[PDB]
Paper text:
Aminopeptidase N (APN, CD13) belongs to the M1 family of zinc metallopeptidases, also termed gluzincins, which comprises enzymes of medical interest for infectious and autoimmune diseases, cancer and hypertension. Each crystal captured a single APN conformation, with all the monomers in the same form. These structures identified three distinct APN conformations, based on active site accessibility, which we termed closed, intermediate and open forms.
The phenylalanine adopted a distinct conformation in the intermediate and open APN conformations. Domain II movement was accompanied by a conformational change of the α26-α27 loop in domain IV, which became more solvent-exposed; the phenylalanine side chain faced into domain IV in the intermediate and open conformations and the peptide plug was removed from the active site. These changes would facilitate release of the N-terminal residue after hydrolysis. The porcine CoV spike RBD binds to a pAPN region that is distant from the catalytic site. The structure of the pAPN-RBD complex indicates that porcine CoV would be specific for the open conformation. The RBD can thus prevent catalysis in only a fraction of pAPN molecules, probably those in the open form.
Author numbering: 59 to 126, 131 to 564, 575 to 888, 891 to 963
The structure:
Amino acid sequence: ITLDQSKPWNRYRLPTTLLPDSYNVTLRPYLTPNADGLYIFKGKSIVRFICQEPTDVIIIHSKKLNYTMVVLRGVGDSQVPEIDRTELVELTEYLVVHLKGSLQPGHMYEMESEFQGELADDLAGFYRSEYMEGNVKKVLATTQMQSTDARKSFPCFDEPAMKATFNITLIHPNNLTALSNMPPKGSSTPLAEDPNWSVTEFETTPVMSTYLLAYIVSEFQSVNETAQNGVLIRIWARPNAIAEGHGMYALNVTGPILNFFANHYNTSYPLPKSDQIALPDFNAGAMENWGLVTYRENALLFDPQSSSISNKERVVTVIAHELAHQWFGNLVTLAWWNDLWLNEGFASYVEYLGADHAEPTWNLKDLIVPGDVYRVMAVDALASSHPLTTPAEEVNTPAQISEMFDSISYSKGASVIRMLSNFLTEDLFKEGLASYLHAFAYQNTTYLDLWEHLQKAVDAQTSIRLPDTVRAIMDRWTLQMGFPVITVDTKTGNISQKHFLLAFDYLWIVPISSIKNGVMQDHYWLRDVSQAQNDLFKTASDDWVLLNVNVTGYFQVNYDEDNWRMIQHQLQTNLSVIPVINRAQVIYDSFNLATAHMVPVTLALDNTLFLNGEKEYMPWQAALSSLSYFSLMFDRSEVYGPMKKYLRKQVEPLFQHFETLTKNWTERPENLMDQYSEINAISTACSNGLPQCENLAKTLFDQWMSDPENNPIHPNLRSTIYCNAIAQGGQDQWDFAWGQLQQAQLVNEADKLRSALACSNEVWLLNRYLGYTLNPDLIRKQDATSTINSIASNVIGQPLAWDFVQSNWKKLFQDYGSFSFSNLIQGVTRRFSSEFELQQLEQFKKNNMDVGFGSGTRALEQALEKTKANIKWVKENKEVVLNWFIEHS
Ligand SMILES: *[C@@H]1O[C@H](CO)[C@@H](O)[C@H](O)[C@H]1NC(C)=O
Ligand SMILES: *[C@@H]1O[C@H](CO)[C@@H](O)[C@H](O)[C@H]1NC(C)=O
Ligand SMILES: *[C@@H]1O[C@H](CO)[C@@H](O)[C@H](O)[C@H]1NC(C)=O
Ligand SMILES: *[C@@H]1O[C@H](CO)[C@@H](O)[C@H](O)[C@H]1NC(C)=O
Ligand SMILES: *[C@@H]1O[C@H](CO)[C@@H](O)[C@H](O)[C@H]1NC(C)=O
Ligand SMILES: *[C@@H]1O[C@H](CO)[C@@H](O)[C@H](O)[C@H]1NC(C)=O
Ligand SMILES: *[C@@H]1O[C@H](CO)[C@@H](O)[C@H](O)[C@H]1NC(C)=O
Ligand SMILES: *[C@@H]1O[C@H](CO)[C@@H](O)[C@H](O)[C@H]1NC(C)=O
Ligand SMILES: *[C@@H]1O[C@H](CO)[C@@H](O)[C@H](O)[C@H]1NC(C)=O
Ligand SMILES: [Zn+2]
């Protein structure tokens, strides 16, 4: 359905003729439904804007708002044109006011409107969340504006670069607390018409993007602390959660992290307070609204009793991430969404800095490697991938904007920034960044503003030298999709680079670390050249070399056979000579190379042989997610049996190691890494049928059922023990776990049960479960997508979920963009390896082509591309893979 752009109201980007100065917004949520089912809110809003250039039309964003139509006033006296007519243009989400005369440049105007909207179970705009306290049902009102939902709350020019000051008022019941970005201005006052309602006015915001606005009406309480910089910190949640002390851990790390960031970047946090609030219904993990940060309960709340170590790492990490946005993205904002990584890439990298400071003994910084680097490479190796910075004119529609919210902007951004930091030295990097923040505070930026400030810092200094300007290096990482594979011929010292695939010509300037028989060598820079030679990369005799120590650069390395064998021999002899992270890398890169058909698949499998004597977290993690792909390809085939037998063989000694160290699973390992390694160990043993593990799970889960009130199972072990107990059992185990889920007060516990229920081997149980997935009384809309994905991951659940998604698609499309919908498509299609399944996917697309795929559109394309690649890969490799596992088991 095309629009003719001759009309500016048919265009997706706002005109540049009018700029907002400030807003007054008054909102009134009605927390009881009217006389059918409907919860609504009422609003009144006034925008003050300046006319930059003459125009006879006023165009602002408005979505799903009903008007009760508008009033235009000149500031003081500028005479003002009369209003001719006023219309809503739905597709493009505009309220359009046609004038009988033109506004004049330099003049200011105020436009006033009253409206009404649904407080939907939407999770977008102004919406309702619900929960239980005792036997009473509670409703609260909350916001999610990013990326373009502000317009769903009140009329505004809803684009990130048009920054304004906001004066917010909330009209709410006497006994409910009203929160916003700023603290309250003075006291609440009774509503004139109805003294049971109160009017709460908030202090003016600093100059700010609309997508950062937040307002909340609830019965929540807080615990509070002042941070070292004088900023007031509060943690808000459900009264029972606060009282049970679930907000304490968040209170411990928040101020310290906020203060760390202010010092590290030499930029003070400008607001008087920063509120953190845990919401029962929320779409993403967390949202960075300036002064009031919103989280899912599982990203904020922590119970040291029933919460996992993973849950705990998730809390500091999400908090750090959200605080980082106070600087990157709030104080300084991207000019437009094609640049999303200037916000998200930065927060994704600095989250690790912040989290490391709050938890210095964890060694978090390493998690960025499996957690960001190798996660995104799988996707960034597609021809359908996109560069960090896409061209502005290619991002227009709301769905295209939501699509920018993918792993490229987050994880590749973080990766590439970690590389930049590493070759600059964070000390130098942070100076450049402080200069960029101070220069651009309360304004917007493009990637070019970033480089120029980094360049300035480099220029002012001597010790660090670059082969080129920061821009020449970074433009190649920023403006072209993908990453190079770097190939080393170890006999001659030839080194080359090639775009890794399943205007700069796909050449990068690549910083290269190396290690020779375990000792550091001089750093090296590969310029943008397809090949070069250096004696750093030449080995003699039995020596070996490894490139990209600690996987600091974003790229993968392939060697000649003989070096590979040397590495392998080293892993058998003393694996400690190789840095633990690079041990993981030899695995990730092996498998990725085998996947892309650039090395025989037996190389990857052979690199798996030493895991025999590996107790460290990361190399196992590398194997697990690498083989995860084989699992997706082969778990329906004859490869599967031998493959499981092999993993049992490899995993067993690690499992025994932990049994002993852990004293019959009574004591938990000391450090985080080792705890992670124990969790992977048990998980792998059970998934693969280690009898000792399956016995453990059955015994423990059985003990739990006979005494529901005391759960015998340590939280770290729960995901694995629940899953396997349910897998081995039947309706009794399932109904028990379901009863636990329905009454569960801790979200972490609920999440573990939700995934475990998806492990049943009975088709009828899984299909019934899918049914529950669409009932909001049973599964909250925010959990529906991940629940369906859990079921799809079950090999027996695969066809159930695929059929369910196809037949429920219309329904699923209206409700459940922002990242879940795309995850649904990706999750159900991961296994398609055959032409028949490919045709199936094509048919699905064709059948639904009318009502589109929305924010999942690009996900569907990548699903198709990958499927095609799987078919070719699976036919080529299955004989070899099968034979290999047979021999080695
Ligand atoms: C909001 O409040 C500030 C401070 O009182 C004021 O200067 C600004 O003009 C107000 N915005 C309006 C009235 O749109
Ligand atoms: C916005 O709010 C402030 C506080 O009530 C007020 O001073 C100002 O007049 C309002 N702006 C209008 C009515 O345009
Ligand atoms: C918006 O108006 C439409 C049609 O007039 C109506 O269906 C809906 O109830 C309204 N939403 C409100 C009043 O919140
Ligand atoms: C607020 O008042 C309402 C209506 O009586 C009540 O349902 C709710 O429990 C109250 N919340 C409080 C007192 O925190
Ligand atoms: C919160 O901080 C206090 C002081 O360090 C501590 O007693 C408590 O263990 C912390 N809660 C955690 C780490 O979950
Ligand atoms: C710190 O920021 C101040 C300006 O607020 C500036 O004077 C100084 O150069 C900055 N120093 C560093 C090391 O970033
Ligand atoms: C975006 O930022 C630039 C400075 O980088 C500023 O001059 C411009 O006014 C900003 N755009 C808007 C709409 O404010
Ligand atoms: C690589 O990482 C380890 C920790 O995993 C660290 O101790 C070592 O110093 C790092 N090596 C380099 C060259 O940064
Ligand atoms: C393994 O190599 C490391 C040095 O990387 C050394 O500390 C250790 O002693 C070696 N182990 C043996 C058995 O030689
Ligand atoms: Zn973010």
